[PDB]
Enzyme design. Sequence first.
Site, PDB file in Angstrom:
ATOM      1  N   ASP A  30      28.041 -10.258 -28.810  1.00 59.35           N
ATOM      2  CA  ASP A  30      26.796 -10.058 -29.541  1.00 59.35           C
ATOM      3  C   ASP A  30      25.840 -10.992 -29.241  1.00 59.35           C
ATOM      4  OD1 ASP A  30      27.802 -11.341 -32.983  1.00 59.35           O
ATOM      5  OD2 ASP A  30      27.258 -12.437 -31.044  1.00 59.35           O
ATOM      6  N   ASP A  79      37.451 -14.682 -44.543  1.00 63.46           N
ATOM      7  CA  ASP A  79      38.045 -14.718 -43.091  1.00 63.46           C
ATOM      8  C   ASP A  79      39.416 -14.490 -42.982  1.00 63.46           C
ATOM      9  OD1 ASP A  79      35.514 -15.739 -42.627  1.00 63.46           O
ATOM     10  OD2 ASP A  79      36.013 -17.626 -42.278  1.00 63.46           O
ATOM     11  N   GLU A  89      41.033 -22.484 -36.124  1.00 64.99           N
ATOM     12  CA  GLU A  89      40.835 -21.377 -37.034  1.00 64.99           C
ATOM     13  C   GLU A  89      42.040 -21.165 -38.080  1.00 64.99           C
ATOM     14  OE1 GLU A  89      37.869 -20.350 -38.015  1.00 64.99           O
ATOM     15  OE2 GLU A  89      36.641 -20.822 -36.308  1.00 64.99           O
TER      16      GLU A  89
END
EC number: 3.2.1.17
Length: 129
Positions: free
Chosen positions: A101, A52, A35
Amino acid sequence: KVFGRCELAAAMKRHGLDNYRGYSLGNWVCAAKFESNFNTQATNRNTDGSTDYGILQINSRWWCNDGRTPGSRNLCNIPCSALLSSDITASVNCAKKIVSDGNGMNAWVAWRNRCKGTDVQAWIRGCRL
Ligand code: NA
Ligand code: NA
Ligand code: NA
């Protein structure tokens, strides 16, 4: 700050990520590598106008406030700039909310495409943990 592989593994372990929601430490280190290349200052803009931020590339569309993503949520209750700190606490605390989540680590596209189903233990081999 650009982390070393073992240095980041130790910091994530201290912040309670090893086996958090069943994801071994190697998964988190692998996701941070693809990432952000372990750089807490990494930012990338998305096609929808959101951005991001940080070592785990947390999106301003849902998780943090950057003052420039219209109609977005701030589910982690933080300014996005707090995710760029050399102290990974805010990124880790926010990642715990994201991974809980319902979709697990599939929320991180690089984890799904480059880590999932691979020998992730290799990311922590040799580390003094
Ligand atoms: Na592992
Ligand atoms: Na923008
Ligand atoms: Na990818």
